[PDB]
Design a protein around this nucleic acid. Structure first.
Lengths: 70, 76, 75, 72, 72, 76, 73, 65
DNA sequence: TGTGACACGTGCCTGGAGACTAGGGAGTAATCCCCTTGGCGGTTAAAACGCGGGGGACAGCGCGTACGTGCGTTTAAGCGGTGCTAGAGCTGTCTACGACC
DNA sequence: GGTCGTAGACAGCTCTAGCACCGCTTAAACGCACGTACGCGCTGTCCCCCGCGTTTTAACCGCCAAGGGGATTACTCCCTAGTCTCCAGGCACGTGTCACA
């Protein structure tokens, strides 16, 4: 329930780096959902890899290996 | 420059991990790398949606553009 | 189950190959697999192009549609 | 013009297999160019694999590995 | 293990001075190690794919040569 | 001429990368030597381009910005 | 964008200085001008990248020299 | 070659500022590039046995440069 | 076990969250026309279907042959510190310099 | 061609991060020997690949009538970005608690 931590100005600035000129008012919810899906995928892959690595935590290299499979 | 504030992103990552599987530890380096990758992915997605919007004879990006870019890239 | 005529596709593949290296033979199964792959690739590209066209309130597909589909597909 | 064997109705059949309902005139030329690029890449990879294996013909494995390189 | 650090700092300094560089920043070493790992991963992936195509178990010189040819 | 990277660490790194890709793979010594020469030549060329970029910027000390610029120009 | 008349004049001049008794059609010069546009926009983007890397906005001859030297010329 | 065309190309390429000698250098590099591409096209035409350089000759020259 | 890695209470600027508003642009539609596409009829220019030679894929058999591993050890080279300083990021200017007709 | 706002090298200017200098260490490597499993062809075989040859399928060409795209433009009209004002974090700063080979 903390996905709202991705504030409207954050999404607006992220689109601003992407060359976007104007943003509709419904982009924010869709972008929050897309971020939830992408972080779920990456976190699940990293967690699976780090359980396969016989560790109870997750490291930066675990995330790098998870992203390499994206 | 990171455009997502560190604390809310950390809270979101920890919440996602807790919902998926409790008793997991995240450190600053892993969260920073994940946030950088997430920001790069979102910038790429928004570039693609801007391309779609410009193709649609439009400048304001609407969720139609987001869904189009996601489904063409194969993520959906 | 194939949409491109087999013999002209054989001719085109052999033309490209002889442009690459001369006096190269082709297994019939190799050409068949290559044609199936090309058909699948174009079917996917046309699916994405139709998606772009219906997104832009259009039915007719235009070279802009294929260019956009390739551009946001990574090609 | 050895690529004209990929005829206009062939591209129409491919598009209608892809769900397209109406096709503009320049789509045929654009699709012909796109397929020429794709075939050039895949055949280049396949002939490179064949040269690596010291053979004078391209077999199914060479094409499969070329498509694997292309990401199919 | 984290064996990319096995590329010693003096080795990178010698490689740079071979290219004519007169001063090396401290952050050059990590970026160079990352770039070298990326290039080596690409070339090794190509060589492994070529070896798998040849139905072999040992990556010979031909596989590495063809991997280099395929990339630049 | 003579190699600049120590042989054994590079052999171990190459074998580790291969194990990451395909396990239980044997390497011919000539193949590893060719990989060593290729990596040395690539790094020498990259550092030459980086030095050119840095000297253009009125500075001698090359910085990761120079390497990034050289890689972007070369298409990497 | 490049006008077709000066481009045709330049290609005719370079053909005269390289191999005379040669004729170019509209499609050939159109392809040449498209290639020219792509090459020049790429070169200018590379020189601009060098310029921002150089803490300057003007694209002097030095940026052209860099983009030519690094790319393989 | 005209200065305004070079300016349009630079603007399309993301250029914000333009120097003085850059026009002459651009003309020179364009002449060299055209010399190379025409040499490749002539070589292919001599290999392809044609009277005049065609569009497919140009495409082949670019793709096998 | 010693050394290392997280969690909770604060002040404050900083960024985000309520509205207000004036435009910029999204959306729907009426022609419209006209400009393509689709579809249909006739036709022909091909593709798809049967024999031959032999080029080379493919299988079996080695056989030196080179990889993996397994030491002895020792010295060139790497890693910790310092000593020292040319060099990088940051200022003011004036001729050199690029934008508007 | 002209007339009007900006700036790159020079000179400091200061801190600094990098180049030696050096002691201590250490593992790369040169050598030696071994097991053996895979590379590299040898040799033989025959699969099918290329090259020629007759018939429906279909691709081209052309014409005609429906349709839909680009465009203008009414035509409101929706609602986003800029602005204004008010309210929730964020990094140091501590103080305390849990993990690992």
């Amino acid at each position: 329930d903390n996905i709202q931590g991705i504030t409207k100005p954050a999404i607006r600035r992220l689109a601003r780096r992407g060359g976007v000129k104007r943003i509709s008012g419904l982009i924010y919810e869709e972008t929050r959902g897309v971020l939830k899906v992408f972080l779920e995928n990456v976190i699940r892959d990293a967690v699976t890899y780090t359980e396969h690595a016989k560790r109870k935590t997750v490291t930066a290299m675990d995330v790098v290996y998870a992203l390499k499979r994206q | 420059e990171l455009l997502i504030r560190k604390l809310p992103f950390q809270r979101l990552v920890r919440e996602i991990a807790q919902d998926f599987k409790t008793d997991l530890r995240f450190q600053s380096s892993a969260v920073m790398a994940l946030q950088e990758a997430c920001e790069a992915y979102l910038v790429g997605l928004f570039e693609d949606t801007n391309l779609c919007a410009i193709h649609a004879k439009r400048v304001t990006i609407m969720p139609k553009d987001i869904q189009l870019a996601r489904r063409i890239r194969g993520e959906r």
